[PDB]
């Protein structure tokens, strides 16, 4: 369908116990393809899927030099933020950025992303029109005035519309077997009666990709309630994901309700009921 | 593929 590529930087100051720590990770869709960790021996953009290992010597040396200079830049970025917030150096802080781009089935460019968070909060993000920034506070405003004078957005747009897309298409084509697959969800139902008066109905989606799912309980027609609970989608660790949804009910009342699964894979959205 | 230039805050 439409696919995406996101890199995620994370820098964390370590007053007294060295220079800050930089960790970056690459993803296409819900599938991680590289990693760099500044504390590691290797000092290199390392591969993280068996399909990205086929890219030639140049790719590795190129990517290492960049993610290495990404780290020296987000290093000094922590230093500036300190000063913008007049915070004491003895304190430890966290700068995360996230960027990347998206394409349709036409393989054509769709959306860019370029966002920063300081200490777990939005700082500055490039609008979907890629000419402007949203500043979260009056320090971001300082950044927003420099970046508008610099013409950062015009330059970053060129990267996103260009090298970012080019990258993504190659990965979708070298990695087609992995990245361009739908794994349908395997769906079973457990029942654990809490007492003789009431029982628990758990709706299981296992071993499906990508992560996006919508699991919906209902009784005798439509039912959306906080009587229902959902655990956040979790990774199985083999490249598929898991989710379960539970609902509680009276006894001998198990067929009044059904569970409904939507996923990219399934030609038809399913229904699940309890057989003793 | 990565960028070759990153903004300063």
């Amino acid at each position: 369908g439409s696919h995406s590529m996101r890199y995620f930087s994370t820098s964390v100051s370590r007053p007294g116990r060295g220079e800050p720590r930089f960790i970056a990770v690459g993803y296409v869709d819900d599938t991680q393809f590289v990693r760099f960790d500044s504390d590691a021996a290797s000092q290199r953009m390392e591969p993280r899927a068996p399909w990205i290992e086929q890219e030639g010597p140049e790719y590795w040396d190129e990517e290492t030099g960049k993610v290495k200079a990404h780290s020296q830049t987000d290093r000094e970025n922590l230093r500036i933020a300190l000063r913008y917030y007049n915070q004491s150096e003895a304190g430890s802080h966290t700068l995360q950025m996230m960027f990347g781009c998206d394409v349709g089935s036409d393989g054509r460019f769709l959306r860019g992303y370029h966002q920063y968070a300081y200490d777990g909060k939005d700082y500055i993000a490039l609008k979907e029109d890629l000419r402007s920034w949203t500043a979260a506070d009056m320090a971001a405003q300082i950044t927003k005035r420099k970046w508008e004078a610099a013409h950062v957005a015009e330059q970053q747009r060129a990267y996103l519309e260009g090298t970012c897309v080019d990258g993504l298409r190659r990965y979708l084509e070298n990695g087609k077997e992995t990245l361009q697959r739908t794994d349908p969800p395997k769906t079973h139902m457990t029942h654990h009666p809490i007492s003789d008066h009431e029982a628990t109905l758990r709706c299981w989606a296992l071993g499906f990709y990508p992560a996006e799912i919508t699991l919906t309980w209902q009784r005798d027609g439509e039912d959306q309630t906080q009587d229902t609970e959902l655990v956040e989608t979790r990774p199985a660790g083999d490249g598929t994901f898991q989710k379960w949804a539970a609902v509680v009910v009276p006894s001998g009342e198990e067929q009044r309700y059904t569970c409904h699964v939507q996923h990219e894979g399934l030609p038809k959205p399913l229904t699940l009921r309890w057989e003793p | 593929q990565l960028p070759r230039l990153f903004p300063l805050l």
Partner: T-cell receptor, first 111, second 111 residues
Framework: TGVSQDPRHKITKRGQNVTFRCDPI?????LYWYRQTLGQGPEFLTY????????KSRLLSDRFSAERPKGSFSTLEIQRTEQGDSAMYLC?????????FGPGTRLTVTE | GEDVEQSLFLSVREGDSSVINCTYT??????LYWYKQEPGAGLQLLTY?????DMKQDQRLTVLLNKKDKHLSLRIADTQTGDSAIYFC???????????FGQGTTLQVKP
């Protein structure tokens, strides 16, 4: 406004030492030195991201040293100046991608 | 490995269109400059295009880019004897914002 550079001309004896100054445009975190010999286009020397000297060249010898203490003005010491180093020593500064150049220091090294 | 190639010298008549091409080194370069040097010391930014643009007009200046061929060209529609100077095309290189320059095209304009 515009980048500044001391001094705009320099004459040294061969093997004396020489220091150029460059003040970039206010609030410009990136600073680059180039040299250019007449007839040619400029060759990159060294790069500063505030106080930190993050790139140098094979070109740059033991003799060559640059410093940007305080993250502002930069210096370029050239030691044991041989005639070979007779050249225009240019300074550029940028908020992000756009470099603005100085008027440069024309250095003549004579025996 | 390789370098930003342009012509050393171009001659042209008052009111003709001067056209400096160069071929740059890497597709991934997001921006490309023309700088200008008159007789003296001052290297002055003229204009630049972004890699996601075909054309860019600016008074008498026009800039064309073909990313596929890594081909960049500067065009000057009426040409004056004042337009005479050295014209350098300049490409980013690596992960700094550092520039590699062409050898520079001298524009002799004939009365």
């Amino acid at each position: 406004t515009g980048v500044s550079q001391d001094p705009r001309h320099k004459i040294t004896k061969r093997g004396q030492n020489v220091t150029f100054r460059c003040d970039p445009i206010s609030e410009h975190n990136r600073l680059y030195w180039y040299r250019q010999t007449l007839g040619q286009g400029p060759e990159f020397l060294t790069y500063f991201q505030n106080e930190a000297q993050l790139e140098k060249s094979r070109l740059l010898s033991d003799r060559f040293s640059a410093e940007r203490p305080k993250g502002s003005f930069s210096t370029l010491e050239i030691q044991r100046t041989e005639q070979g180093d007779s050249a225009m020593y240019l300074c550029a500064s940028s908020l992000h991608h756009e470099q603005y150049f100085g008027p440069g220091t024309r250095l003549t090294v004579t025996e | 490995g390789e370098d930003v190639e342009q012509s050393l010298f171009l001659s042209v008549r008052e009111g003709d269109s001067s056209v400096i091409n160069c071929t740059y080194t890497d597709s991934s370069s997001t921006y490309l400059y023309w700088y200008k040097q008159e007789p003296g010391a001052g290297l002055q930014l003229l204009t630049y295009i972004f890699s996601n643009m075909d054309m860019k007009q600016d008074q008498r200046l026009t800039v064309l880019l073909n990313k596929k061929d890594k081909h960049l060209s500067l065009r000057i529609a009426d040409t004056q004897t004042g337009d005479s100077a050295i014209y350098f095309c300049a490409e980013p290189s690596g992960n700094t914002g550092k520039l590699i320059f062409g050898q520079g095209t001298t524009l002799q304009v004939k009365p």
